[PDB]
Every structure is written in structure tokens, then in C-alpha cells.
Symmetry: C3
Subunit: 199 residues, 3 copies
């Protein structure tokens, strides 16, 4: 068809099956809801993200860990080969489309790639910047969330993949401090870029 779609994640944001690594290299479980479109070669991506002190995992309490403000989330079309944030199998429409139809076209501003790890922290300092106010509860007080978002080339086992990288940038240290209970939801974050291929 001229238009293909992909949907993945937890509509309730109550299943915490993806992964995000913060600037102190600490890995956490998170919830997400991902909706994507490939409209004749234009990739449109909608993303919600949620963290919850009760499900994210252990928060180290050393000063550096507790004061972390940035964390990275990766949307991938390569769920087995290059999937650092653990995007789940979802639903592609129509049946003749395949998830690789949702790869972004290569970023023409960046050609040195990130070497993929399962728990490595990558911090982009280039690209588009958006600003969100999050929905927070409890003692969590990150303030505004800045969002750096771009396609990034990623190398894994001699292959190159372009993924979508989101750097979520809290104004305040708060959510990675183990003394503070609460939750945070951000979205829907919209991002468009050229797709690698036509559907």
C-alpha cells in the first residue's frame, strides 16, 4: 500500500517491558506506547514514555547516580539485531508490510556511528530540540523535559542500522534519587523524518 503502520507497547503504560539508560549508565525498565506511519516514504512517529519508581528497578544512591537528569530511549525497526531499548513485537499493517519499512533514512548530518551495547549510554548533542512539560506524581519533580531527537547510525557486528534516538533531559535532578517515590509520563512526542524505503 502507499501507507503502512506499526503499533507496539502498552496502551495503559502499565506494562514496563522496555529499557532506558541514564547519564550515570544506570539501566531502568520503562513503559512506552509507539505508533508509527510510513506515508509514501515519510516516517511519522508518536511516542509516549513512562517511568515509575515502583517498577523501574534499583536506583543507586551515590551522588552521581542520584543527580542524573538525562536518559536515552531508542525506537528501532530491528527488534532482534539492534534493539537497545527493548521495543516489543507489535502489529504491522497491511499484512504485506514488514517492520524494516519503518527504518529511518540515514541522517545526512552524522556518519560516525554509535557502537551498540545492551546497556551503553549514548548522548546525542546534535539535532532537533523539543520541550515538554511532563505529567508527574508523588515526590518526582523533574520540571520541563527537553527532548533531543534524531535518526542515529548504529554499528552492530559489521552492520549499520539507523535508529531513532530520544534524549530526555530533566530540568531538575529528582527521578533517579532513590529517596523520591513517584511517576512521570511524557507524550505524545511526535517526530517526522524521511523513511529509508517506500512501503
Amino acid at each position: 500500500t502507499p501507507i503502512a503502520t506499526f503499533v507496539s507497547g502498552s496502551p495503559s503504560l502499565n506494562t514496563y517491558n522496555a529499557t532506558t539508560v541514564n547519564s550515570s549508565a544506570n539501566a531502568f525498565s520503562c513503559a512506552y506506547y509507539l505508533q508509527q506511519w510510513n506515508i509514501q516514504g515519510l516516517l511519522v512517529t508518536s511516542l509516549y514514555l513512562k517511568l515509575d519508581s515502583a517498577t523501574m528497578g534499583n536506583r543507586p544512591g551515590d551522588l552521581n547516580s542520584a543527580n542524573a537528569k538525562w536518559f536515552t530511549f531508542w525506537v528501532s525497526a530491528y527488534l532482534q539485531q539492534c534493539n537497545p531499548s527493548g521495543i516489543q513485537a507489535g502489529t504491522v499493517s497491511p499484512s504485506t508490510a514488514t517492520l524494516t519499512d519503518f527504518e529511518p533514512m540515514a541522517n545526512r548530518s552524522v556518519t560516525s556511528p554509535w557502537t551498540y551495547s545492551a546497556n551503553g549510554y549514548y548522548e546525542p548533542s546534535i539535532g532537533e530540540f523539543q520541550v515538554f512539560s511532563p505529567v508527574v506524581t508523588g515526590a518526582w519533580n523533574p520540571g520541563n523535559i527537553g527532548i533531543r531527537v534524531l535518526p542515529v547510525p548504529v554499528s552492530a557486528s559489521g552492520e549499520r542500522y539507523t535508529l531513532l534516538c530520544y534524549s530526555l533531559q530533566c530540568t531538575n535532578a529528582s527521578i533517579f534519587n532513590p529517596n523520591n517515590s513517584g511517576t512521570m509520563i511524557v507524550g505524545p512526542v511526535l517526530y517526522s523524518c524521511p523513511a529509508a524505503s517506500l512501503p
Copy 2:
């Protein structure tokens, strides 16, 4: 079809038949031009807004009223049941589509709803933030317009609707002061989010 469209409002921005309520709970007539797309479940909305001292209505001159800087505009797909800003009947294409095809999908970050009034002021403090420089004339000097925009759940008579809420945030007090004559146009403001349904 895979794509449906809706167009409503005043192309000239010279018919002032919609309504906006400002932070002092004062209601004003405004002009708008609304163009929307439902592209296989992706809702894309383009909006222009205009205020004119000569057509907006009486501006109370108490300090609180005169110093108001924020005002809220509502795009609705429910023109009879939940239409706080008075969006006008328009044109849906194709003929097999219906305006409810333009409801946004529920915001997954917010589930406590706004109780609809015809003249109630609602102020979102969550969601995406955009920045526009307005087109102004006369003594109107709002400066930059910040725009908080998101889908919001709205309760009316036991039913729930998701609307698009725009909070337009003047840098300076100016346009609600009855001593100042002039006009302001902002747009085109673009906003995308998932639609509730496929066309």
C-alpha cells in the same frame, strides 16, 4: 478512503464566530481557520487564530483583566455536544467520512477530565510547547506567543470526549488591556497526534 480531510472557519480571518476564554475568565470572539487530515489514523491539524480589538468584545479594565496574558482555544470534532470554542460546521472529504473521524485518540498521559463549561477557563500545564512570533498591528505588543498544545479528555453530561487544547501564552500583557487597539494573528500552528479511529 485512507485519507479524510476537514476544513472550517474564515479563510480571510474576517468572520469572528469562534470563542476563546482568557486567564481572567473573560470570553472573546475570535477568527480561526482550521484544516485537518486523518491519514490512516494520524491526525494532522493546521490552525490560524486572530483577535481584533474592534470585534473581540468588551474588555474589562480591572487590573487582573487588563493584565491577562494566556487564553485557551479548543478544536473539537463534536460541534453540538462538546464545542467550547464554537468551531463552525465545515466540509468533510470524502462524502463517506464524518467529523467524528477527526477525534484525537485519548491522551495516554492524562485521564482526569476537564468539566466542560461554555465559558469556563481551562489552563493546561502539561504537554508539548511551541513558540511563535505573532503578526500584530496597532498598539498590541504581546511579544512571543508560547503555545501549550495537547489532546485533553473533557467530560460533558456523562460522556467523555477528547478535544485539542491550545493555550496561547503572551510574553507581555497588552492585548486584553482596553486602552490598546490592534490585532494579532498567529499561525499556521501545526499539531499532530494519533487519531481515535481510521477513516
Copy 3:
């Protein structure tokens, strides 16, 4: 078809065949990569821009020239009649579409037009503002790039055209100072607005 596409420019950003004029009225050669969609009357535009001290042309070294921070780039659907930035012939799909299918609908906030020159500097002070961090090399240190982007009406020989205008706004003076060698890439800059016509 319901969807038409246009692609033009240098995928490598290594062919410098377009033109940008900066705030000191100095003209430079630049590289670009332009991908556009007309989705049933919605115009979506993706743009990369690159400058390189080695290919941009002579940089005057008077204080005013060297300290220039803003420069304007024009995306046009009128490659012969109104093409101030020198957008190159490209590829329209399908074969039944024509490049004029990519004209933006008129900006409803602005009706006084710019008088086109081949080397005139136009500076918009109205419209949407985005923020990018650029990819830079060498001694180039512009810092963040603010981007004012909007459709603008342009008059040429009694005809009116709407073009897309991008004002790229460096934080620091740097890239127009002839003492500083280096390069800058910004993108992909995405911009949507209503199209003048259906494909």
C-alpha cells in the same frame, strides 16, 4: 494520486549548487537535500543544509560581515520564475504530478509580499521558531541554530508566489568570519503547512 513527492539536491551534501544570503547581504553557495510530500493537500518538507568554508565563496572580513549570524534559505516550487536560493531540478512522483503541486498555500497571517531579488536578504520576524544543534567541524562554533520558518508571499514581475522561508540564526558569530575554517550541517529540518492544491 492522493500523494505526490519531490526530491532535489545533493544526497552527499557535497555538491554546493544552491544560494543563501546572510544578514550582511553577502551571498554564499551551499548544499542542501530537499524531500517533500503533498499528502492530499498537506505539504510536508524535510530539509538539510550545509555550509563549508572551502566552497561557500569569499567571506568579506569587515566587522559587520564577519559578525553576521543569520542567513536565509528559500524552498521554491517555481524553479524558473521565483527561485532565490537556486533549488535544482529534481524528481516529481508520480509522473502525472508537477512541481507546482508543492506550492504552499498562502500564509493567512501575512499579505504584504517580499520583492524578489537574486541576491536580496529577507529576514522574517514572524512565524514558527524551532531549535537545532548543528553538526560542526573545524573552528566553526555557531552554537545552537534557531530556525524561523514560514510560508511567505513573494512578488516578482506582477506575479505572486508563496515560498517557504527559513531564517537560520546562529547563537555565535563564527561561520562568516574569514579567519575561521570549518563546516556546518543542520537537519533534517521538518516543516508542515497546507498546500495550495490537491495532487
